[model samples]
Target: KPLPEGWEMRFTVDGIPYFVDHNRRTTTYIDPRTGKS
Candidate 1:
């Protein structure tokens, strides 16, 4: 089987943030440019 690995991309949708992690899981909505993690 092939693995999924690549540079992470980050973007904002309607003021919400969405991104894909290394595990291939779509993270929940977060602050687009929040100082906190």
Candidate 2:
């Protein structure tokens, strides 16, 4: 899925689909945008 503006698409060394939010500087295994993952 396309990430929202200010959101960064990242991955783990093994490609775990990590996600980062530039708005609050938060990162997680699940996508923040996906939650709203």
Candidate 3:
């Protein structure tokens, strides 16, 4: 599945993945697809 509109993915150099929603002005460490903490 594709990511939500206006959503982007970024990760740290240490291998941590996170999602960013530009329109929402939010950032999350959890996988947006998995919806977990």
Candidate 4:
């Protein structure tokens, strides 16, 4: 069995001026359209 390592994913809400962090880990960015460390 696997320990189920944690992972994060992000998405953008078009015209929202920012990206959304589906799995919260840290401040999400808009330029790269992804979550930041």
Greater-TM-score candidate between 1 and 3 = 3
Q: 26, model 3: CA deviation in Å?
A: 1.0
Off by over 4 Å in 1: 1-9, 30-37
Rank the candidate models, highest TM-score first. Answer: 3, 2, 4, 1
Indicate which candidate wins on lDDT: 3
TM-score of 1: 0.22
Evaluate residue 29 in candidate 2 and report its C-alpha lDDT on the 0 to 100 scale.
73
- Candidate 2 C-alpha lDDT tens digits along 1-37: 6788888878888977777888889887776555735
Clashes of each: 0, 1, 0, 0
Where's the lowest-lDDT run of ten residues in candidate 3?
28-37
CA lDDT of each prediction against the hidden true structure: 0.45, 0.76, 0.84, 0.38
Error of 2 at 14 (Å): 0.9
- The RMSD of every model to the true structure, in order and in angstroms, is 8.2, 2.1, 1.4, 8.2
Per-model TM against the reference:
0.22, 0.63, 0.71, 0.22
What value does the lDDT take at residue 33 in candidate 2? 58
Where in model 2 is the C-alpha error above 4 Å?
Answer: none
